[PDB]
């Protein structure tokens, strides 16, 4: 239950971990990293689309990073709420009844009745 709720938070954390890294790593690729070495497998060839990687990185990585944050602040304050939902608080003078508890009260009511109602005996 609580478990399922947390799983989500863990996933969000993992998401937040994986994207400042893509902002850093994709920075390299965005800055353009054309290799004299043939083995290296990142591409930035065509005009529009290779600097478009830079426009997409911006929106993608930066909002995924900030988004992981917004979602994770939701996550946080969600748990806070959960805790302000509260628990069942038991009575403080339970087992030791306060006030004129008893028939004793029956007497009290009779007193008020004669008091308010008229006749002098």
């Amino acid at each position: 239950m609580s478990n399922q709720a947390l799983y989500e938070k863990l996933e969000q954390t993992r998401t937040i971990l994986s994207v400042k890294l893509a902002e850093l790593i994709n920075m390299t690729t965005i800055a353009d990293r054309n290799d004299d070495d043939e083995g290296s497998f990142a591409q930035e060839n065509s005009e529009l689309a290779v600097a478009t990687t830079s426009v997409m990185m911006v929106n993608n990585q930066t909002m995924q990073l900030i988004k992981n944050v917004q979602d994770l602040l939701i996550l946080t304050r969600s748990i806070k709420e959960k805790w302000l939902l509260n628990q069942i608080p038991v009575t403080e003078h339970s087992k030791v009844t306060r006030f004129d508890e008893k028939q004793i009260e029956e007497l009290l009511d009779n007193c008020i009745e004669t008091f308010v109602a008229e006749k002098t005996t």
Binding site: M1, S2, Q4, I88
Partner: protein, 253 residues
């Protein structure tokens, strides 16, 4: 009457908690109650067809006589005393109250008889996947008795039935929204060769609503919802589910 219901269970462990929880969800305390049920089958000496004077396919079924036992006939110790039902149920776990329950079946402790709830139920509504257990119950109240053989046992024999088996149940029930009842219960088989708790280990959980209609699809559909909401609200704490139909069929068997 139509009884829509959901079932589940908790070990005695979970009871304390569940209680505190159920009180908050319902906003009423649990209320202590009990009941004995005596089941009867058609006298196996007689023999009858499965058809009416109005050619109808009619199956033999058991009858269920149910009523309260005042706790004075049930409880082991005053020391425990108190009013609290859950702490008291641990006291009751594994084993029997006085019982020997035969005694009451034929008076004792020159006599007339009590009121009973005389019931007969049908297998829950055939359904490929039901969201809720929906069961029909035919009932009449017996008010008192009269005549030569006025003991409940004589009466049942007069009608052509025979005593089959019996059980006591003690629990707490919660009165709730739109006729919803929650019973947290324990059941004890009562035989002459001693009593054993059917629910030993925990509590049978039953959340239900008896509906007067049947033929008001709307109130029936409303009722489904109620039960659903409950199961749902408590989901991830306790699953309320529909029992296997086959397991609620009081027929010949």
């Amino acid at each position: 009457v139509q009884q829509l219901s959901l079932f589940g269970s908790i070990g005695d462990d979970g009871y304390d908690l569940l209680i505190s929880t159920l009180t908050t969800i319902s906003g009423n305390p649990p209320l202590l109650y009990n009941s004995l049920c005596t089941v009867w089958k058609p006298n196996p000496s007689y023999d009858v067809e499965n058809v009416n004077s109005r050619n109808q396919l009619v199956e033999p079924n058991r009858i269920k006589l149910s009523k309260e036992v005042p706790f004075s006939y049930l409880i082991d110790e005053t020391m425990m005393d108190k009013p609290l039902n859950f702490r008291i149920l641990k006291s009751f776990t594994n084993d029997k109250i006085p019982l020997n329950y035969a005694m009451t079946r034929n008076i004792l402790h020159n006599e007339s008889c009590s009121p009973w709830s005389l019931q007969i139920s049908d297998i829950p509504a055939a359904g490929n996947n039901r969201s809720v257990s929906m069961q029909t119950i035919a009932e009449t109240i017996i008010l008192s008795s009269a005549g030569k053989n006025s003991s409940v046992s004589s009466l049942m024999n007069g009608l052509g039935y025979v005593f089959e088996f019996q059980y006591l149940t003690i629990g707490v029930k919660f009165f709730m929204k739109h006729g919803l009842i929650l019973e947290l219960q324990k059941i004890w088989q009562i035989e002459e060769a001693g009593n054993s708790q059917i629910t030993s280990g925990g509590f049978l959980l039953k959340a239900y609503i008896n509906v007067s209609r049947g033929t008001d699809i709307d109130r029936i559909n409303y009722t489904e919802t109620a039960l659903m909401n409950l199961k749902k609200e408590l989901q991830g704490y306790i699953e309320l589910s529909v029992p296997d139909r086959q397991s609620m069929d009081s027929r010949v068997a």
